[PDB]
Amino acid sequence: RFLKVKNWETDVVLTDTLHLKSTLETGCTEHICMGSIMLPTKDQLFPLAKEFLDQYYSSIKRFGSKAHMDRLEEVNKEIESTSTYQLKDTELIYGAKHAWRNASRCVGRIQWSKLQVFDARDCTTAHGMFNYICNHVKYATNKGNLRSAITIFPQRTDGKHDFRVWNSQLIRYAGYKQPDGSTLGDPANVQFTEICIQQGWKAPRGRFDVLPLLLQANGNDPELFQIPPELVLEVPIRHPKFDWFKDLGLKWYGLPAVSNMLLEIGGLEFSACPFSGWYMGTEIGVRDYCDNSRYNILEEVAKKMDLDMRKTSSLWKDQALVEINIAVLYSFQSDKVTIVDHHSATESFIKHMENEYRCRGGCPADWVWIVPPMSGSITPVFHQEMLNYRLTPSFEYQPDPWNTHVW
Template sequence: MGNLPAVLPSAARSCGLGLCSRQLSAAPEETTGTERGSTTPTRPAEPPRFARLKNWETGSIGYDTLCAQALQELPCSGQRCLGSLVLPRPLPAPVPEGARPPEELLGLARDFITQYYLSLRRENSPAHAQRLREVEAAIAATGTYQLLEPELVFGAKQAWRNAARCVGRIQWNKLQVFDARDCANVGEMFSFLCTHIQYATNRGNIRSAITIFPQRTPGRGDFRIWNTQLIRYAGYRQPDGSVRGDPANVDITELCIHHGWTPGDGRFDVLPLLLQGPEEPPELFPLPPELVLEVPLQHPTLEWFGELGLRWYALPAVSNMLLEIGGLEFPAAPFNGWYMSSEIGTRNLCDSQRYNLLPEVALRMGLDTRTTSSLWKDKAAVEVNVAVLHSYQVAKVTIVDHHAATESFVKHMENELRTRGGCPADWVWIVPPISGSLTPVFHQEMVNYQLCPTFRYQPDAWKVYVSKGTTVTRRKTFKEVANAVKISAKLMGHMMARRVKATILYATETGPLIPAATHPRGPLRPGRTRHRRRALPQLLAAPAAPPESRRCPPGQHGAGVRVPLLRAGPHLPAGDAGGAGAGGPQPVLTAFSREPGTPKTYVQDVLRTQMAAEVHRVLCQSAGHMYVCGDVTMATEVLQTVQHILVQQAGMTLGQAGDFISELRDKNRYHEDIFGLTFRTQEVAFRIRSQSFSMQERRQPGPAP
């Protein structure tokens, strides 16, 4: 980093790259760690506090103080930097020979539980103290503990947020977490993975998701996915030493063949999944073709490009990394985002050790490949990237170009520095493999360190697998796979049937999703929710939908359960609508804030004047849920209105009402889906959670309004 001393006195424990330092001053003893003429570094008198980071394009200066919280050593030292190594020796997580010592696990668990309650602004609350006691008791009794589902969700999102090598972290808080910790065998594992692929692919509108399988348990084998990604193309080694297909996947291809897979002979053959259970040998599971969305590659102006027969899959789902949360390790936790175009167009297709398309494309383009000064590689690589972007956009499959991705990362980093005090980032991985200096991240100094929760590299599954006496497993037929999926779906149907039925009505400001939400074949059908938990009485506060959606399909409700929908906005005319159930037609209450000639009315006004008794009944008497969907201002005012309703209807003080809503959050019964400026996610969440009147009342007692 150009504005830091060339080498700090020693490797800073709080920052693995040795870049964290307390504020620099003019005093020589503060800016150097060696005596004049000495080559032996000495430790600074005080521990490092922060890293000073400069953007050489804009001249702006930022300070990373979060690095002081990193306790895990990275491989760099005061004498050498190993930041350009893909897998430095200390990075892969070793396979533990036994359980973590209880005192080590307890320390990691306490740190994570405190992180969780800090995120809720409930640190040192009775709920926080009680949860710590539960974890301590579990570790003392069993040597381990289990995460609650909200803790698991929080931990998975934080792990993505902390992933220093990921450029797409601006979406970290939108990660969909699938809890598969009750998975019992590889057959169920395959069903969970099929569900993940189907959800995340979403017919091309890619959604970020992670599926988390059971945690590592001492004395028992691991659940592992042997494939590096859920979808990969085979690589067939040829007699002359060349590879047909993807050379990166030669090892897993040969393993699949060894375990019974009948290979093809194409350049883009989708590999089966090779799955391992705790007490089961690895088994093969071919992916149903309808699950794998692929994009044929064509060029907008080079007509011959389609003749190359190229294609790539839509979903990049990494499946060989270890997720660590609170000292617990999850060796099988596949996750996905969506592609940045240069990952496909530059690395996968153009790297000489991968598909190596540059010579063929350059020849077709008529470029002079005899000399590097013709820049034939650069010209051909650009056209391959153009083809990838064009093809994915034509196929309506989510993809982002490297300029947009890196601009969003700079905004994410600025936001993290402002709201969190830092952003771990590995410059070598963040800068894209094409047009690096043309992107803003090239000019931005970064500091690399590891925080927990985290994703970690781990040894390849086949290198640590111990055979139980069976070396080859018979390949599963498609009929067997279909039967396994059918049985899994039937079991899920029985579980769904036991729930109390409820209808959640959908609302949108823009309207494009209305056909999917109201059509009987759409993704939200009467009697179904997106939640796996038992349906309970619910209140939904959300923006308005266009007029055509005001009539909703018939639905079923539990006896006596009303599910009112609150909508606010300029689009929906006055009137009632709803699904017919045991209680008759359900009301839709409207609030207009931009209707000409009409007094402004907001969701919180409807709550206060028409729904106060219902809010009290659902939240205080029926153990129900409240969903708030809107921008930060609306969500804040709804929260304050609910507190006043609890004061009036339940006889609480403002402080008690604030604490009650905080407890609802702890129990995942008060939900907030805040939209608006994507880049302000953390700031918005912080603002919402700081609106409780509890502290205000304790400072300034006064009568309830």
């Protein structure tokens, strides 16, 4: 019931108790571990609200005070009469920060308390949503000195009036299948790019076309907005030694901003809650560039490097991988756009885990997502046992809107 996690590199053992407050389920049972699976009414809401308000009032050292009792009282009143309730600003901010704190898959959580929360609960149209998002983009971008931020649109009501950003991230590149049979741009966004076209977007048909927003206000049909080109900071990718690298014509955007997830706070559901931080280099260099179903550039880079591609055992893929990743980091740093390397980020997370064990009694972590996609065992997180469990407030995955929406 009280659980140990060991670091195998340093022998440091931590004791986890925080898991006993876990509310949601994992996917796993005593018979099967699902740790590597990507995706494993009035009555229900009152308990959820209470659980949340209890933790909030505890956090501000006023647990069981008159102000605590009065608020629980007031929310109970409100649910009974209205069937939902509204969070105080203070609660909303607490909820959002804690949803990030509880993100078991996020290596960057050392930062979690420095989160700029934009309350867009007064938003009523898609045009207002576009306005909110442009402001989030410009604030978070901060001319390259990135600042963490979330923009929180109105909560779900009867579920027929959902706000949704149809995009998966605020900024992403279009994918188009070719007569050639191949794929131009990012293969991950073909379906969403077609949707956009279908609704009327005129696509430039290049390899790195920033997609438009498709925004859904109040359960309405989504509409299209181009983010002002000048708000989208991009970085040309060059290598500090290989002059030919720039000739590949690679670029990536500075701002990673997740926009398809659901924020749950005290039982309330915020279905449009775009959030953003800054990149760890491997995200772009390893995943976006090298995944076979992504820009899949390994083969071209290796050839330009004149490596032996006759046999897997020359480790030509591995060699090219490191260089691509050196180039990503070098380009971002040269243009003064915030980026973190995987050594620095994982080191930060081990420190954050120590902190969270010490001050909170644990830190849910998902080892499968936390360990970087290159050079695993040379980062400290590889050797750190992690317990994965689900706390609330949280961010949750939700179905892609085009499968839900009725037009």
